[PDB]
Amino acid sequence: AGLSPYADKGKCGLPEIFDPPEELERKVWELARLVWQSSSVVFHTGAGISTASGIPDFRGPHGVWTMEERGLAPKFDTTFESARPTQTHMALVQLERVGLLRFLVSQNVDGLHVRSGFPRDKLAELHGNMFVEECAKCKTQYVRDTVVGTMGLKATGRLCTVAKARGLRACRGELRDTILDWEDSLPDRDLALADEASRNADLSITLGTSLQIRPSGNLPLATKRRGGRLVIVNLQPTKHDRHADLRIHGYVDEVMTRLMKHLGLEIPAWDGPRVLERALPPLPRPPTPKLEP
Numbered sequence: 001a002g003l004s005p006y007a008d009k010g011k012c013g014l015p016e017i018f019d020p021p022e023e024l025e026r027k028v029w030e031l032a033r034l035v036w037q038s039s040s041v042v043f044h045t046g047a048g049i050s051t052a053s054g055i056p057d058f059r060g061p062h063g064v065w066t067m068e069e070r071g072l073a074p075k076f077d078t079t080f081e082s083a084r085p086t087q088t089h090m091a092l093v094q095l096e097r098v099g100l101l102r103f104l105v106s107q108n109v110d111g112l113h114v115r116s117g118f119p120r121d122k123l124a125e126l127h128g129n130m131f132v133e134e135c136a137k138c139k140t141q142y143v144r145d146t147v148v149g150t151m152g153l154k155a156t157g158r159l160c161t162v163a164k165a166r167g168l169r170a171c172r173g174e175l176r177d178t179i180l181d182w183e184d185s186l187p188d189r190d191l192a193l194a195d196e197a198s199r200n201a202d203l204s205i206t207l208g209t210s211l212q213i214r215p216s217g218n219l220p221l222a223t224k225r226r227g228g229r230l231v232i233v234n235l236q237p238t239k240h241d242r243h244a245d246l247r248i249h250g251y252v253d254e255v256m257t258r259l260m261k262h263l264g265l266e267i268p269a270w271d272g273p274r275v276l277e278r279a280l281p282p283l284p285r286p287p288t289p290k291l292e293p
């Protein structure tokens, strides 16, 4: 970690919980009905959906902050550039393709949602993206193929190339990274879209986040606030466990694989990094799912 020293990293290293198989099976069927029936589905993702790609989380038993409390560095089985989207990442791509996902709110800086092919206009990256730099003068973002090279909103060394003055010159503004440091204000645009999506959802589903950061972790509560349903999928306890209508303790890849199977949808294969700015028009709404035995 090349971001500021900071006391309050929240509750780290709590034990993991696994729902027994009968209960897990019933819960994922309930999740499948909810997703199928709801008019406006918002997913909230954190670091737990990228552990299967080899990227450690922050507050899990081997998390970056957990290990830091005992002086150790975390283990990175991949670099950000070489990380591959998980089944969860690709399941979200497909749910968006078939009109079963309205918006995706992510706290992850790992760049995997964009790189999986998920459309940027349905994505809020609340804490940054290691691959994205932004012009300090005109606010244009650049999605790079490789990590921009700084963190904590510093200058990257590159300048903005967007044409200005009838195309007689470039903006030349200073490009800076988008990775927030501790206590930085969230990106205005992304937060406002995320809060709007949550405020108008009838279903919010959280995946692999302990929900300990504010305001990011409080956004799913806005769904519950208007009488919509809240689902939390996580191995550890989360801050907002007491507000969930449905709580699922299991491997997020297991949950999402079973969910897609219940919806009658294939999880597509990833074929290398993409960047999709705007969502395509949806595929046909899938055949009506079969229900639980």
Ligand SMILES: Nc1ncnc2c1ncn2[C@@H]1O[C@H](COP(=O)(O)OP(=O)(O)OC[C@H]2O[C@H](O)[C@H](O)[C@@H]2O)[C@@H](O)[C@H]1O
Pocket (backbone or CB within 6 Å): 016, 045, 046, 047, 048, 049, 051, 052, 057, 058, 059, 060, 063, 107, 108, 109, 127, 208, 209, 210, 211, 212, 213, 233, 234, 235, 236, 237, 250, 251, 252, 253
């Ligand atoms: N395969 C898995 N399946 C289900 N749950 C999992 C899995 N792997 C890990 N978990 C759970 O996944 C959860 C991940 O929780 P946290 O580690 O706090 O990550 P955040 O995304 O909420 O952290 C938010 C910000 O805080 C930081 O400062 C950064 O700025 C972050 O952006 C754990 O509770 C694990 O049990």
Ligand SMILES: [Zn+2]
Pocket (backbone or CB within 6 Å): 135, 136, 137, 138, 139, 140, 160, 161, 162, 171, 172, 173
């Ligand atoms: Zn610019």
